[PDB]
Amino acid sequence: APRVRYLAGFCCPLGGLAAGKPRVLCHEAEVFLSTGSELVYVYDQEGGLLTAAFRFPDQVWHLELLAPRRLLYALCARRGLYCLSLDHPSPVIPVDPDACILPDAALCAFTLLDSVLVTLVQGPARWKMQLFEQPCPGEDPRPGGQIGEVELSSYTPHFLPVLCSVSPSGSSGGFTLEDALFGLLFGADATLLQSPVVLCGLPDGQLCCVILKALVTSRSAPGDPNALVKILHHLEEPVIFIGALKTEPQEDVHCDCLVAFGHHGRMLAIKASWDESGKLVPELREYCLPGPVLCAACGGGGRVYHSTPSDLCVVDLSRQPEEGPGGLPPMLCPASLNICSVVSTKLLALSAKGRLMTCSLDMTTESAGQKIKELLSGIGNISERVSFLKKAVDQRNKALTSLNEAMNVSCALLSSGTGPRPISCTTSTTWSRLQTQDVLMATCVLENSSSFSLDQGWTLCIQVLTSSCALDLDSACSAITYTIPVDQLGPGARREVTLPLGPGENGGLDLPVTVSCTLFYSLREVVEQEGVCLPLSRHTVDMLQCLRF
C-alpha cells in the first residue's frame, strides 16, 4: 500500500550528492551503500535499522561484493583497496590499515570476477589496466602477484571511469551475452577461449573492452596496447553505466543487447542483426535522451531504470531489430542517483536529497463523490500552468517571425539588386542660421520602400568622419557618432534627421567630410558577443554642397 517507503536519510551538502561516486548494493536483505563520503553503511532491508557502520580514511569510490567468500572490497580514494570479513567480530567501526591490500594509491576503478581482481590505475597521461590473482582458497585475503598490465594508449587526460565483465555461455559479479552477440562484438579468440572480457568506459566517453585470457605479461613480456585493448564506440561524453539486456523475452540470463550511457544522454544500445547478406552485423543506434543522466540500472526484461536530475525515468527496449527512438517515462520518483535492481521489479536507491528508499513497481457511496471533487481540483491545479506555458510559447514564436523579418531585410540589402530598395537613407545639405552665424546642417532621411516594418530591436547609427589621413597630432575630436532607436517604421514611412557638421571652434570647417549611416539589430531587445550592425548608405559632403550663393 506504500509503493515507496523510507529507511534512513543522510547528511547531504547543498545541491545534494554528486554523480559517479555513491553506490548501493543489495545482498539478500543485506544492503550496502556508499554515500561518496568516507563511510560505507549496512542495512537490515526488512527493518531499515543499521547493522554495521564503517569509517575508512578518505572518500569511498566504489564497492563490489563476493557472496561465496562473505567479503566486501572498498576503494579509499588516494589509498589503495580495503577488504572486510562481513561477520567482523557504538555501531561505528574504523577499519585498521591491516585490511589494506594493494595500497597502489594511484588506482581509480576496480571490478571482480571469480578468483580474479581487475583494477584500473591512473598515472601520468597513460592509464594502464592492471590485473592480479585473487586467492580461491579461504586464506589471508591476498592480492597475489600481477599477471597483467597494459596501457590504454587511447586514454590521455571528477568522472570515475568504469569497467565491465562479460562472460559467454558455459563458463560472479558481471554479464553473460548470447553466444551470437559475444561472437559478433569481440570475435573468435574471445569466443573460443570462453574468455570473460572487460569493458572500460572512460571520462572521454571511450568504451574499450579487454580479453582476460590474453592479458598475461612479465618484465620480459610487456602488454602491447594495440593487441590487447580494443575500442568499440566513442560516445563523446563521460560514461555512467554499462550493462546487457534481454530483449526478445520469449538467474544467469543470456542477454542479447549491450547497453552504454553518456552523461548528457547519448545512450547506445547494441544488438545482433544477421541481416540482408545472410551475415552477422551489429545493430547500432545512438539514441539521444534527456537530461544529464546520473545513474542507471537493468531490471526484469529489457527495462533500464535511469535518473535525470528532474525525475527517475525508465526505458523499454523489448518488443527490423531493436527500435526507431527510446521515448521514455518517469515513474514520478525524484532524482535518486545511485539505483540498483534485484529481480522477484523492486529497485532501490539513494535520493539526491539524502534518502535511502525502495520502490515497488508493477464502488463506495459519496467517497466516489469525494474522488470526483478531488480529480477536478487536480485538473484545476494543472490547467493554469499548461496555459502559462502556451503564452510563453507565443512570445517565442512571435519573436522568430520578428527575427524572420530581420533576416529578410538583411539578406535584401546584402544583395545588390542594383537599387537599395528595401530600406534607403538620403543625406543632403542645408545652410541654417543660429545666434548669428551661418551653420551647415546635413539632413538624414530614412525611407522604407519595402513591406518590412522595422520593429523594436532596430536602431540607427550615424558616424561623421572628419578628414581621413590620421595625423602627427591626434585631433581634439576624430569623428562624432549619433545613434537613435528606429521604432515601428512601417512600409512607405520615413524619418529625417538634421545634424550639425559646422564650425563652432575656429570658424574652422575642413572637407571632404563624410557621413556614413548604418543599422544595428539588437537580439536581446526582443526579450559570444551579440548584435548585428548593417551598413546602409555612405555620402561624401564636398565643397560643392557647402557653397551658398
Binding site: 512607405g492 514611412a493 520615413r494 524619418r495 529625417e496
Partner: protein
C-alpha cells in the same frame, strides 16, 4: 501637418511622456476634451476686416486675421478653410472652428 502643402511624411511630435526628473522619481519610488469659445459682432469683424482683402466675408477672413502672423496663413487663404486641427508646442492636438 495634415493641412500642410507638400503632403510629405513628417514624423508626429509626441513630446516626452514625463519630465526626466519625474521619470527618475516614479522609478526610484516603487477623458473629455477641454473647451473654450467666444462670440463677436459681425459688424465689428466686417468693419475691421474691411480693407477687405477678397474672399468669403467672415469665418474664413476671421481665420486669415487670427493666423495673419503665422507663416501658414496664405495656404489657408488659397484653400479658404474655416476650421482646422493644428498641433502645439507640447504635442497635444487642438481643433479650432470659426
Amino acid at each position: 501637418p495634415g493641412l500642410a502643402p507638400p503632403h510629405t511624411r513628417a514624423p508626429s511630435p509626441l513630446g516626452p511622456t514625463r519630465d526626466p526628473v519625474a521619470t527618475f522619481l516614479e522609478t526610484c519610488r516603487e477623458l473629455p476634451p477641454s473647451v473654450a469659445s467666444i462670440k463677436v459682432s459681425a459688424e465689428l469683424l466686417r468693419a475691421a476686416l474691411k480693407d477687405g482683402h477678397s474672399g468669403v466675408p467672415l469665418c474664413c477672413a476671421t481665420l486669415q486675421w487670427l493666423l495673419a502672423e503665422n507663416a501658414a496663413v496664405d495656404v489657408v487663404r488659397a484653400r479658404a478653410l474655416s476650421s482646422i486641427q493644428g498641433v502645439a508646442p507640447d504635442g497635444a492636438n487642438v481643433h479650432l472652428i470659426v
